[PDB]
Amino acid sequence: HFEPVMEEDEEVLYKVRAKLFRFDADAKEWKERGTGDCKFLKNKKTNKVRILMRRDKTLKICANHIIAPEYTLKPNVGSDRSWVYACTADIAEGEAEAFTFAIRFGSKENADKFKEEFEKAQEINKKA
Amino acid sequence: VQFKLVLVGDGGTGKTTFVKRHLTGEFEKKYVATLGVEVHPLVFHTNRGPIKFNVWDTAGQEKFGGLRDGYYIQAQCAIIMFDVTSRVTYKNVPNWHRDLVRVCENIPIVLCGNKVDIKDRKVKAKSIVFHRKKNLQYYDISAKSNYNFEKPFLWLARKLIGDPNLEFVAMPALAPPEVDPALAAQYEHDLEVAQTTALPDEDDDL
Amino acid sequence: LYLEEMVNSLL
Amino acid sequence: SMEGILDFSNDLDIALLDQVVSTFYQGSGVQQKQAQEILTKFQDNPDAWQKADQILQFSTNPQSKFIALSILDKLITRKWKLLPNDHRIGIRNFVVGMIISMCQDDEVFKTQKNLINKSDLTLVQILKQEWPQNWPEFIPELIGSSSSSVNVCENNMIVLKLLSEEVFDFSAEQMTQAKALHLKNSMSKEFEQIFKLCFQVLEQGSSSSLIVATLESLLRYLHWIPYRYIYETNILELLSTKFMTSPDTRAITLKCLTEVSNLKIPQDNDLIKRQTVLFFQNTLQQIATSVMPVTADLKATYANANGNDQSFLQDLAMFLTTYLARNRALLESDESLRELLLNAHQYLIQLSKIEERELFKTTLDYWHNLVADLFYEPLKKHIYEEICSQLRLVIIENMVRPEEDLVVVKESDTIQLYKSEREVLVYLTHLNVIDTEEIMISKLARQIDGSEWSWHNINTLSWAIGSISGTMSEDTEKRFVVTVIKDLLGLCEQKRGKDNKAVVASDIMYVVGQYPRFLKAHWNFLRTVILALFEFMHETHEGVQDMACDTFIKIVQKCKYHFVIQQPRESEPFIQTIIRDIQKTTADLQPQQVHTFYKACGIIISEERSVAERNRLLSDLMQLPNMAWDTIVEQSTANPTLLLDSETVKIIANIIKTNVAVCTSMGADFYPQLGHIYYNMLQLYRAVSSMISAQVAAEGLIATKTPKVRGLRTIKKEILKLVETYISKARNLDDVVKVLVEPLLNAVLEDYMNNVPDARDAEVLNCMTTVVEKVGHMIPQGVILILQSVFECTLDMINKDFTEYPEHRVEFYKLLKVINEKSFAAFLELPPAAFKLFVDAICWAFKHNNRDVEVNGLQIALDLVKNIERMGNVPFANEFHKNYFFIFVSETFFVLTDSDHKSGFSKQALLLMKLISLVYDNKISVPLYQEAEVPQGTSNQVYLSQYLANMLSNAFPHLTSEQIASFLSALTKQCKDLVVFKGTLRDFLVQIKEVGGDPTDYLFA
Ligand SMILES: Nc1nc2c(ncn2[C@@H]2O[C@H](COP(=O)(O)OP(=O)(O)NP(=O)(O)O)[C@@H](O)[C@H]2O)c(=O)[nH]1
Ligand SMILES: [Mg+2]
């Protein structure tokens, strides 16, 4: 005998490339928050679905919140491939915090697919 | 585990825009000249634990220079920035390097040619050779398109920690909380403004 | 794929 | 409370200063920020320098003393000569004294290096003011004080290093020509003594810190000292042996020897040639025995990144490449030097394997120098055959992606590196074609046997194979190409999964695209290639369709002729077959890819020089867009609300984009297609314009951000781009003028003028620039109409700041520039108030930092002056000079001297020299002064000097009348000599930064 020499508990329902914006109310200006893969993650133990989005390269979190059933996706005046909605608790940057998010995609086709996945996940969080 | 980083270069080269991109993810289109210096903590998550950069973003305009080389005292790393669309900013790289290494005699330094997203490039790849004899790392970067935007910090982290295999890793993603009628009319106001403020750069691929 | 006709046309 | 130090009526509380300083450097957040603004205000107080003597005496904080020296540095470099001589002597004395006492306390000398170096630099600033004229004993006393103490000797090496840098390395920008020469001559006069001290220190060993500092100063001296100090002393022996053994001195020593390898050296002295061989021999010997042998794995060493290994290997590459590019011939004839020559190159081979982009480019630049010489120089290549064989493998294995393999943002640094790699590998192939083929075939076998298979590795090899196209003979290439393609096809079969099969398929198409010579001689093969690409245009795997389209147009650009003629065993030119099946071929392609396809077809069609057949091919190619077009013109005109239907808008935009793509390929030949759509296209332009206006009216300016309006404006922009693309390439300019222009101007100009600013398309300006460029000389009334419609309303958009409407800004001045070139008469017709706006607009352009505006502004000004001069002595030219000559002189002087427009210095100087020369060549016929303000008969020369003297006196009040007078005397003398003229301006820019500049400096030239 010779001797020899935190998204793991979750399930990916939907993944899409996107650019995330937050609205700076004080400057009446949209500011980019990150670009990367937006994921809907289903917790196997609670069945609660969240959005988790990380920036390319640095992999830093730019969105992390439940897809609340109360939220509503709304169009933006300047885009046929984005959605605007209010988020009451995102924890991408430490303490919970409310934001008016906008998320944009590569095509109107991906934008519409995101919306139906967003709605399917909303009902899943209703049941649980 | 923190390291003082000084960022120097001509005015308008994109130093503050570059830092802001790393701090918030935003891209500031306006040129608001830095006055003296702005200090910002910047943390990266690595397979060796978190590394904190205390970034001293200095002014490049002479009339706003403040303490000038006084900002360099006890820096442990540095970024020298120029603009590949402005030849004069590369011509001044030896002057920024001179003033920098007189105060900081043995620190890792990255030279960054910013704004490579712009089509009409003026400082061509083959002209950029100053880093060779000075042992600086060089990167083409764009704070606008994010091209190589992480490379300067990744290289500096590897030099400062002393681990050539250090990598950025994904910060842990805690479970987010679950979700007030008294603010329903307040959020519907802020939302209507946000819907009718157009998103910028609608022609970008994303 | 008609990379097959390519092999023949080459030999 | 921290703000107390800003109150100078009180005494300075040193403990309060130290607290502000510590809060800034060691504090955080809000306190740090407040302290920063306080320190800045303190440092900027013009009396802060009086309190530096205190700080340097009684502060215990090194940062506080550093700041105190920064304050002194401002004073010394800008206001030294304004002081009472008592303060100059005093400041000098307590700088000298502070340095002495810091060097005598070993603890301070050891722990306050930052503060000592700052004090040394401050001292050097005094030397630049005071030495040697008011300090002749400085160097003799420096040499004397060096022997009394190792610490003082070491610090004096730092002072001399900084002095050499300030005099020889950084003087060009920072002092006048005369003062630079004065200090260079002064250092040169006393260097004999300086070198003696430096050589004694090096020869007699001592503190390594003292040795290193002496070598660091020597590195600076080598930039300028005469070669005899290096070749007639023993210093080369010391550098190339003693100091290479110790790692402490090894890094600086290697840098010194790199610079030695650049000294100005006589090329006929046999002794010097042996000394140059010898120090190279010693250095390589020390490396092989003290650092690492020739066989060492430098790739692994560099990756491990221990200590200063990376910097050392970088420095070694710089030394080897520098020396060998200059001196390798010294080693190539003597057989006793062959081992040295090849060992040196073997180190470079090993250095070339390091994974470090920028270092690879340094070694690659050297390899290029070598293989180019072996390609041309008789009897050399046999020496390096084994080096070259290894280099072939290094380059093949490090091939980076060329612009054409878009299967993975464009990377321009990667593209430049590829072209450099290709150039070297092409030379290496010519040097030994057989060896290159064998390496590439061997590498390919190991891709098939899986030993080295990978996505990165098969791409790298395919790029290398494609890069040597044109180096082999046609027979060898033929056998070579067949083998490669054969082996690559079998590799595509071997693998499963579309991802693997995709990589190989793309590599195949890349290689074939790089060998058009082979395709041109094998039609049946070329035909099969195209047909395979077409079938790839249906493959929905990511990147396949793109590759297929890019390869199609790349092959077409090179083999177009074989698509336009009828081939032996075919019934029609293959272009006809492509056109017949075009709907099927492109059914699965995205719009952008469809346009590339049509563009490729246009390339082929333009090779048909029979007009009737070419026009028929053009008609058949455009059948699908033309039918879709005819339909829409019928529908969109019937119910103008369709143009709100986003799908009709997209169809229309893509029809026009298809026309742009084909027009890009066909240029002048596109005219028949343009005529088919032209008139209805401009009517569509008008209808779309009404919709955009009506939408802005009903919804507000925010409408311009909506997808519907953006889609409508895309139509307008593509129409303008189509017209611009044709006119820029048209050969029949009579048709342009008589058929195209007047409908165009009627369609675009009034719409531009009468839209609100946010709705005006900057592309209108760009289209007009092309119109004026090509036929401006033929439409003088059309050019007037352009100015009337775009000049004043565009100027009003861009003359409130430098940032709003950036595209209109750039296009605006490109248009005025071409109008000023081609149709200057149009500016002569302007009402005086409008011509005055024209002048204002030019000067406004001067003041931009935006290079895309400043350069055109300065060029318009220069061209305008020349246009006026060409008119001779006529009333319009005389009124121009009376009204605007001094506006241009003073506006140009402003941007030259305000330190915010340094990018435009050369053209500012050119314009200023032109203006001054007009007066001194008496090219201005009328007096430039009022009849009252000067005696009758005064020359414009005299008045110009007086105007400028007064202008500069008020703008730079700290200059003496003598400075201004000498500057202008030299400037006007030198207005026929641009290089000297510019030197005098740069001297002036130095002097306005300080008080007491020497007026005789302007006699330098
Ligand atoms: N196209 C492009 N623009 C950039 C890029 N980076 C910065 N900019 C722009 O350049 C301008 C100046 O940016 P800024 O960060 O303020 O430069 P700075 O070096 O900090 N100037 P200062 O030294 O005076 O503070 C801004 O308009 C910014 O949007 C880039 O990568 N690409
Ligand atoms: Mg800034």
Numbering used by the authors:
A (entry chain B): 64 to 68, 79 to 201
B (entry chain A): 9 to 187, 190 to 216
C (entry chain D): 454 to 464
D (entry chain C): 0 to 376, 414 to 444, 456 to 1052
What text does the study give?
The chromosome region maintenance 1 protein (CRM1) or Exportin-1 (XPO1) binds 8–15 residues-long nuclear export signals (NESs) in hundreds of different protein cargoes. NES sequences are very diverse but each usually has 4–5 hydrophobic residues (often Leu/Val/Ile/Phe/Met; labeled Ф0–5) that bind hydrophobic pockets (labeled P0–P4) in a hydrophobic groove formed by HEAT repeats 11 and 12 of CRM1 (9–16). Here, eight new structures of CRM1 bound to diverse NESs show several different and unexpected NES backbone conformations that share only a common one-turn helix element. All NESs also participate in hydrogen bonding with Lys568 of HsCRM1, and mutagenic/structural analysis identifies Lys568 as a selectivity filter that blocks binding of non-NES peptides.
We tested mutants HsCRM1(K568A) and HsCRM1(K568M) for interactions with three previously identified false positive NESs that match NES consensus but do not bind CRM1: peptides from Hexokinase-2 (Hxk2pep: 18DVPKELMQQIENFEKIFTV36, class 3 match), Deformed Epidermal Autoregulatory Factor 1 homolog (DEAF1pep:452SWLYLEEMVNSLLNTAQQ469; class 1a-R match) and COMM domain-containing protein 1 (COMMD1pep; 173KTLSEVEESISTLISQPN190; class 3 match). (C–D) Structures of Hxk2pep (pink) (C) and DEAF1pep (purple) (D) bound to ScCRM1(K579A). The 2.5-turn α-helix of DEAF1pepbinds in the (−) direction and is slightly longer than helices in true (−) NESs. Superpositions of Hxk2pep and DEAF1pep onto wild type CRM1 grooves show the fourth turn of the Hxk2pep helix and the N-terminus of the DEAF1pep helix clashing with ScCRM1 Lys579/MmCRM1 Lys568 side chains. The rest of the mutant ScCRM1(K579A) groove is highly similar to the wild type groove. Therefore, the key feature of the wild type groove that prevents Hxk2pep and DEAF1pep binding is Lys568, which is not only a critical hydrogen bond donor for binding NESs, but its long side chain also blocks binding of sequences that do not meet NES structural requirements. Finally, we find that the HsCRM1 Lys568 side chain acts as a filter that physically selects for NESs with helices that transition to strands or end at the narrow part of the CRM1 groove.
